[PDB]
């Protein structure tokens, strides 16, 4: 029955979430061990053997998802893989493959951990967290204020974030990494989807500021460029700001420009043929032609 398959899919999704929580706990444990050893060595050499032993031990335990030492989990995964529902089999296979890669996943996640120690870094983190939380809360209630003080506060938040993006190669890279870690791009993309009328100058200014922030986010960062390219469909609309954002996303990116799909390229020539608004489409094509 379809209901049973959907229930099993939801159970599998819950299992994925809990496994991610376990991964986060493992990363936290490793960080705590490292901090304890660092404090012991420097109250103001490092015994890496002890830390390695603790890391090995933590993968042995209370973190297991069953009382059979993972036997029940493996049995359930195999049984689900034997089913016909394609999404269920795919999820079971993904979980099965992830089961035997826990150490590799933990090391990969630990590599990406970012530590904020400087007071300026802590202040930046707090400010970004507060601003993003307020922006998300206000965007979630779009129907309440979308045609008030909401517009002014939103505009101030966008300007503050744009100024927070930073200036300088090292500063820009650090701020971009921090913003990626705080999921600001998701908030901005959700804001772009907000429904609005075409006769509101304030909303146009807000969208312009959002596009400026998005362009600054991926400026010179291939990782953020790919992250934004993952959501192309939003930007494929008849607009000038969207064309500028697409140009910035594809700017100096061989991996994206070279593998650009046919419909994306035909979109801009179609707009030129039917609209021909400005030189934004030509600029996008010119930047797409050359990369690195």
């Amino acid at each position: 029955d379809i209901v049973v398959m959907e229930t099993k899919l939801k159970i599998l999704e819950i299992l994925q979430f809990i496994l991610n929580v376990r991964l986060d706990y493992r990363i936290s444990y490793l960080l705590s061990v490292f901090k304890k050893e660092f404090v012991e060595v420097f109250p103001m050499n490092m015994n890496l053997d002890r830390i390695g032993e603790q890391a090995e031990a933590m993968f042995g335990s209370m973190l297991e998802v069953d009382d059979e030492g993972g036997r029940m989990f493996l049995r359930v995964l195999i049984h689900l893989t034997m089913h016909d529902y394609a999404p269920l089999v795919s999820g079971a296979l993904q979980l099965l493959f992830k089961h035997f890669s826990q150490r590799q996943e933990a090391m990969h996640t630990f590599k990406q951990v970012q530590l904020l120690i400087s007071a300026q870094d802590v202040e930046n983190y707090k400010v970004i967290k507060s601003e993003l939380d307020r922006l998300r809360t206000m965007v979630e209630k779009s129907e309440l204020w979308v045609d008030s003080e909401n517009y002014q506060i939103v505009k101030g938040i966008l300007e503050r974030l744009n100024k927070m993006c930073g200036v300088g190669e090292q500063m820009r890279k650090k701020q971009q990494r921090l913003l990626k870690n705080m999921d600001a791009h998701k908030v901005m993309l959700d804001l772009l989807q907000i429904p609005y009328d075409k006769g509101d100058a304030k909303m146009m200014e807000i969208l312009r500021y959002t596009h400026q922030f998005l362009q600054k986010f991926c400026a010179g960062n291939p990782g953020n460029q790919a992250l934004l390219h993952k959501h192309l469909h939003l930007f494929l609309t008849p607009g000038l700001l969207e064309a500028e954002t697409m140009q910035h996303i594809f700017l100096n990116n061989y991996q994206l420009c070279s593998e650009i799909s046919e419909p994306v390229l035909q979109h801009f020539v179609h707009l030129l043929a039917t609209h021909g608004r400005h030189v934004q489409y030509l600029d996008f094509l010119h930047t797409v032609i050359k990369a690195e």
Partner: protein, 384 residues
């Protein structure tokens, strides 16, 4: 707080942990192969799931799903193909810690329950691995999926398995899409030839790197002098026939520089990077001709490209640039060329092939080469 010092210590700890856990990661990944080998042991004997697992139903379902998910999830397809290839590989040791971890995991999951490679290959073929490989090669548009399919084919055919060769021949004959399979192989061969020609003209490309696995697969098809496969690779009896033997000879001729290489400029074209591919091509041609296959011998000897002159030059020429630095590779190349020439005349009572070879392989130079090779022993360095 020491920001720079803290970051440096964190990086050092990350590097140490990465170095330490590699054997454990390998052992943990390996345990998955054992789990896939005997899934029924996870269930209770006499149960429905146990019956499904024991009869190979799990592996067949996995292969069918892999075929289905080629377009839905390319990454999952690649992962499953790699897992199958690992399943077809020989066992390996991961150190004391790795072995301990592997044994502990096997005990936890499975409570207490070349011949092995051949049995595994036969089992996978029974579950439908060969059909999956053929379908993926014929239909896939992803380079990684094609590479994994070719690798799985090589692993299945590794060691010259007669049953796998028979299954491949049956699929090629009965199936209606064998024409597309051979067309894809021919198109890739031609693309590699064109890329090599362009690179030679300019003076190493995925289209050229892919030739090594393809040549290895074609050689494994004809291994042990399989007459049916040897003849099929030349003529498939379809509406349009693709002669892979002729294409292999053309690739060898283009790689070595064609007539210019035969004149004596062979040294420049052949270098350290591409020597292995030339060796593989020579081995594939030898496997085509040995047994013997008279039609393949005639095709190679009388080819319009005059690729036999390339082989004779390979034997006679010294390969001045490469031989100075890597003499072992030059010796291997000469040995492979001599083996190919011998295979071209395995059981031919007529002199046609002998005279054609002697046209370019003059006797005085051959005797001088033999004497030089004999005298080089005193200068030999430790090598296979």
């Amino acid at each position: 707080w020491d920001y720079k010092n803290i970051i440096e210590k964190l990086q050092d700890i990350i590097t140490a942990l990465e170095e330490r856990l590699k054997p454990l990661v390998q052992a943990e990944l390996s345990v998955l192969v054992d789990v896939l080998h005997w899934p029924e042991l996870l269930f209770l004997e006499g149960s429905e799931a146990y019956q499904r697992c024991e009869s190979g139903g799990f592996l067949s379902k996995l292969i069918q799903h892999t075929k289905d998910l080629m377009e839905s999830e390319e990454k999952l397809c690649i992962k499953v193909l790699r897992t199958l290839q690992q399943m077809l590989l020989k066992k390996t040791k991961y150190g004391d810690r790795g072995n301990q971890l592997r044994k502990m995991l096997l005990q936890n999951y499975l409570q207490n329950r070349w011949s092995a490679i051949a049995a595994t290959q036969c089992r996978l073929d029974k579950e439908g691995a060969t059909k999956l490989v053929c379908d993926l090669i014929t239909s896939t548009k992803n380079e990684k999926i094609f590479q994994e399919s070719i690798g799985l084919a090589i692993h299945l055919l590794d060691g010259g398995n007669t049953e796998i060769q028979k299954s491949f021949h049956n699929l090629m004959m009965s199936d209606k899409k064998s024409e597309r399979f051979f067309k894809v192989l021919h198109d890739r061969m031609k693309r590699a030839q064109q890329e090599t020609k362009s690179t030679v003209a300019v003076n190493m490309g995925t289209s050229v790197l892919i030739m090594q696995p393809i040549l290895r697969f074609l050689q494994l098809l004809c291994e042990n002098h399989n007459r049916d496969l040897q003849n099929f690779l030349r003529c498939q009896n379809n509406k349009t026939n693709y002669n892979l033997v002729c294409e292999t000879l053309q690739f060898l001729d283009i790689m070595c520089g064609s007539t210019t290489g035969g004149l004596g400029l062979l040294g420049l074209y052949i270098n350290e990077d591409n020597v292995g591919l030339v060796i593989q091509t020579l081995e594939t041609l030898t496997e085509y001709c040995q047994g013997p296959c008279h039609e393949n011998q005639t095709c190679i000897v009388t080819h319009e490209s005059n690729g036999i002159d390339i082989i004779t030059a390979l034997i006679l020429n010294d390969i001045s640039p490469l031989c100075k630095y890597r003499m072992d590779l030059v010796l291997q190349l000469k040995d492979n060329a001599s083996k190919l020439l011998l295979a071209l005349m395995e059981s031919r009572h007529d002199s046609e092939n002998a005279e054609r070879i002697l046209i370019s392989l003059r006797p005085q130079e051959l005797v001088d080469v033999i004497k030089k090779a004999y005298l080089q022993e005193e200068e030999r360095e430790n090598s296979e």
